Amino acid sequence: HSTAIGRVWLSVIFIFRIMVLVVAAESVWGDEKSSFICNTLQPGCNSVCYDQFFPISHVRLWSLQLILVSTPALLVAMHVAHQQGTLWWTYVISVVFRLLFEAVFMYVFYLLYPGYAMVRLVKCDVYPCPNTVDCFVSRPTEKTVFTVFMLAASGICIILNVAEVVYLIIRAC
Amino acid sequence: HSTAIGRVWLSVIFIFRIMVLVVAAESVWGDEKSSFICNTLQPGCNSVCYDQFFPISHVRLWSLQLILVSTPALLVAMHVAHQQGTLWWTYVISVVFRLLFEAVFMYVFYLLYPGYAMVRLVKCDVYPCPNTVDCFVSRPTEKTVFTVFMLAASGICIILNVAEVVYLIIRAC
Amino acid sequence: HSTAIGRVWLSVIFIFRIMVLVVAAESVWGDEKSSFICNTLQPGCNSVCYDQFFPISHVRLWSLQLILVSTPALLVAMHVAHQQGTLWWTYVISVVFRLLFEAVFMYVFYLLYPGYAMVRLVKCDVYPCPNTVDCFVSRPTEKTVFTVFMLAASGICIILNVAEVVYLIIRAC
Amino acid sequence: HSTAIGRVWLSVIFIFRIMVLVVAAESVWGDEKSSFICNTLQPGCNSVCYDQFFPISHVRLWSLQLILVSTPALLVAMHVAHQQGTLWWTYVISVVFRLLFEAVFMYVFYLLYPGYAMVRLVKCDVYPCPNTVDCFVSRPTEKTVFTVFMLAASGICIILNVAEVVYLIIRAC
Amino acid sequence: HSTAIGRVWLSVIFIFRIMVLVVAAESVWGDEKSSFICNTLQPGCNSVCYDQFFPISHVRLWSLQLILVSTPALLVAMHVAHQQGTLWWTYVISVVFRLLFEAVFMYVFYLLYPGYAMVRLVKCDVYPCPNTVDCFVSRPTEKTVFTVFMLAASGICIILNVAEVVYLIIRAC
Amino acid sequence: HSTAIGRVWLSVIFIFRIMVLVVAAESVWGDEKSSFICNTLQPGCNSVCYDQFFPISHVRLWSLQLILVSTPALLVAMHVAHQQGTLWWTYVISVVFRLLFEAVFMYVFYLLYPGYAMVRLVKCDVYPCPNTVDCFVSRPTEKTVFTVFMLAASGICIILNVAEVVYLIIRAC
Known part of the structure; x- marks a missing residue:
């Protein structure tokens, strides 16, 4: 029932996000917290500083995004x-919710990580760490590269979903 | 034999809980105890304080909940x-037990973890730790986010199960 | 050839034990020995004290029990x-051996672990550890919860197997 | 083409060995060398003492045995x-080689580990460890229990294979 | 629709790259950062120096390359x-994009790692590491061997793709 | 199209090598470098000495050999x-290349590891390690046993491939 722009391109891009996320989950983000060390000797500051700068990791944000994005597709199936009956309205509603989930997760990514580029050193000033301590992110450049790939794919998904809605509306009218 | 509210929505939400739990099991809660450190030098206080504040982890509570929730469904299948025969009574009984399991596990979650929000620092006062020691939870914010997602999905399951019972009763009468 | 009490209930409970054991194998008992530390500085006392108090772990005891319990079922298949021929005698013999395996493993659990409740601290007095040392069990409460679940399921299996034998005897006579 | 004593019993026992080995491979023998520590401060003596007392581990000895035992069966298939043609001679030859592999590996187990019971402490006197050092085996009792189970199953395989040869010879004559 | 040079040789070489990458992902590059240590005592310099010399690892570069290379093939399927219709133009366009992806990733490999040979010691001069520190790469020779294998296979893919385009053009004309 | 000596024996031996390699990959060679320690206090000498004595590990050499050996078979399939057409020439060429790959990898094994027997202690004299340091190989005897098994199987493959070529030539003439 879908048109060509979503039947082929959107599905392939979704598979691309799945494969990239699987590759980058255990490998890139496997040692995100174990190798996250701070310059201070205060016990327990590695955990609190990691949580402060990474409230939710990119892989799990993308994992939740992919589950949420595929949820309207799973509902239709x-x-x-x-x-x-009139399943066309059901499909277009699912596409709209899929577009909203993509936009919401991209905006959530903007809020949680202002600036889509990891930095080697982060200035952590939180209890119990005295004053400001220097904590070091594991593989900042590699995570940045995969962040760009995933965000670019998500942006493509947003554009394809918008084109999907427009094409279906034009087809109806 | 099921109606639309449980055939589609309840199954999809259950799959959503499965996928989220699988993502958050090895990743978020993988280093729950290994990275759980306390500010004291007393040997063995990491284990006792972790057990005191986490008698059973969220993932295993959700894993047990999902197995228990699917048990009446597995019994019917x-x-x-x-x-x-009259399998309608068997199905509605299974739905009622499924609803009870959801409610019981949600109440168990309330008892074990009063307040559905992890805190970075926990005040542990248990033998052999002298007085009160500061222990730090691994990824408190990330665990809180997944706790909200799982509890919200469980609440949706409770509402859908109640609607399932009401719809079946209305259908019978 | 089986009756309803073993065809449905016994199979479902067996699947329940399988799923619970799989969840609790890598997760709960994954760090049973690595995080098992003792208060002494004597080298090698973590291993000997762990072996003294855990001659065989609960997961492997349950894993062996499940293999042994399923062995007569595998033999019949x-x-x-x-x-x-007269396969009814073969089936009832398999059920009897299945019941005996459940009873034997439950009794073995009683002997190996008198008192089905893990304790945070264990008093270890064995060579080369001088006098008595304090060793700490990893996740004592979580292991206790899964021990109760597995033992309760095993007790249900014992009751169902006894009911299976009685029902088959009544059917024959 | 096989008789009942090898078609059912031998296959089931082989599956029993497979399942027990899989359970005991990653779990019991996972930390055989990592947790194998010696009382000496000499660097590198953990590795040489572990190799001296465990030239080849039980799991890998059993893994090689199971592959070798199944090799004549794989050849026939x-x-x-x-x-x-006359495939009966091919089958009996495969059974004889299977029996020989079982006997050879059991004898190899006797040579490598004289006395089928792990000991907590081993007296290691090898370069560069000065004089004799005390090294501690990980999970000696648990490994002993699984050793008894595997050796008992191997002995059953030897008896069943001998009965298989005798039954086939009686059938021919 | 493909000719013999791409139907057989290109597919086999692609499978060869898949198998080699899978073997070398968890094994060779599993401890790329954990065992990457520097001669300095400055905290956090292992991470920044590893990121400086390995902005993106070879396995993940090859993993991304293989996903990108297979993307036009996935689009056609x-x-x-x-x-x-005229799917010949679609296929040749996919082959051209596949060739471009191979060339781009090979050029990216040249830029990121000038000189396709790992060195045991790397001179790291980056904040916060004082002056220049000596950091040691894990398995430099083994990574070099797999780098040569993967680059040679990629070069074969480039040659085969060029031959594929030439053969199809000759077939058309 | 193959004769009996390669259809059955060669395939079974290849499966034997696959199973042995899988067993010995994660288990025997899992801690090849992590547990490879040297007697010196010089930082980073564990990595350089491990690379010097193990330019490429046995498992990955065998993994590459098995992929290369199966490549002509994959090409034919x-x-x-x-x-x-005349696929007989294609098959015999594939067998010849398979024989060459076996011989080349066996010769590579001879060059990389002169003497097919691991030694507990290796004398490492390389920068930055001062003078000669004593480094200890993990599980030297276990690796030696699996090396003998794999080399013996490879030698059997060489003999079977030669017999395959001779049998096919005799069949043609």
């Missing part, structure tokens, strides 16, 4: 298999 | 395959 | 597939 | 599938 | 399955 | 499936 579950709904179609059980019904088998 | 096993019963139907072997019988192949 | 292997025997039936190769024969395809 | 490969030979039959490609031929599809 | 997705497009063909949904269409089922 | 890919070629046959796409053609479906």
